[PDB]
Amino acid sequence: MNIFEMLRIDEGLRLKIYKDTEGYYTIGIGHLLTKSPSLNAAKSELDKAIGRNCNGVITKDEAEKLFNQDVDAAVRGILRNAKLKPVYDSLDAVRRCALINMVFQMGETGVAGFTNSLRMLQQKRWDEAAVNLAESRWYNQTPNRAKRVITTFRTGTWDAYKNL
């Protein structure tokens, strides 16, 4: 299992504009288009993103291209971030994917806000960190996905996804 397969499980793949869990316009594999309520603002953003007139629909290939870009941006973001980097450097390979997962979903800023959890992860206090992470809006809004991620942090294995 790898970061791509992990995220493909958690986000799914949709070739037509859709609304995410939060009500925002998304496409492909969790690619947020706009927070704007306008489907038209979404369609414009999408064409800008693809470089073609898409009329709200993209191919598998386009979806994957965006996916490659997003994962890449998530990793570089972590490595450039003063709060995130030290955490990432301290982790094993599997746990590293768990952090990339959070960043892809909630942005750098969002994850960097999890001060206490970050501290516990750095300290390798797995159980403690899992419990802290669960006390969040993140967990309340998307419990099954949050649990899969939390489990990955807790155990350092791909068990939560071996099912799926």
Side-chain angles (χ1 to χ4, degrees):
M1 172 116 334
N2 65 49
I3 192 53
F4 290 96
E5 296 167 359
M6 192 198 201
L7 282 164
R8 170 70 177 69
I9 289 168
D10 283 338
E11 297 293 351
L13 166 62
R14 304 199 217 162
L15 306 176
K16 177 100 244 269
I17 290 177
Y18 74 92
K19 294 184 189 196
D20 80 1
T21 63
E22 300 277 2
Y24 312 129
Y25 282 126
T26 307
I27 203 154
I29 306 149
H31 182 85
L32 173 70
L33 295 160
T34 185
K35 293 197 193 180
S36 148
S38 169
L39 174 69
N40 276 313
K43 280 148 107 138
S44 160
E45 278 308 303
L46 174 67
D47 286 348
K48 171 167 64 90
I50 299 312
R52 90 192 176 45
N53 248 65
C54 294
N55 184 33
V57 169
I58 63 168
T59 71
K60 208 178 153 135
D61 278 66
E62 288 169 349
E64 282 163 359
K65 176 153 227 187
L66 293 179
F67 191 28
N68 285 152
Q69 304 168 168
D70 299 343
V71 177
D72 190 63
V75 171
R76 291 194 276 88
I78 285 167
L79 298 170
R80 266 195 277 114
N81 189 290
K83 264 108 178 244
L84 297 180
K85 187 184 194 310
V87 184
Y88 191 88
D89 292 335
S90 77
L91 297 172
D92 60 90
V94 181
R95 297 188 169 88
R96 274 169 187 178
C97 297
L99 194 67
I100 295 173
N101 192 307
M102 297 185 65
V103 170
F104 179 96
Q105 192 188 353
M106 94 191 67
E108 231 192 86
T109 308
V111 178
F114 287 52
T115 300
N116 306 317
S117 291
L118 295 182
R119 207 194 66 252
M120 300 174 210
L121 290 162
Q122 229 197 303
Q123 300 170 47
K124 310 201 182 268
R125 303 179 176 214
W126 318 128
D127 282 45
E128 306 95 305
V131 156
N132 187 263
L133 283 160
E135 296 285 342
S136 51
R137 181 199 192 262
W138 170 61
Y139 184 84
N140 284 100
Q141 287 327 109
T142 47
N144 294 150
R145 157 171 205 171
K147 274 174 211 151
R148 284 195 287 280
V149 176
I150 288 161
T151 290
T152 303
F153 277 130
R154 206 185 20 103
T155 70
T157 72
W158 294 112
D159 294 350
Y161 291 87
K162 279 169 181 167
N163 278 32
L164 287 16

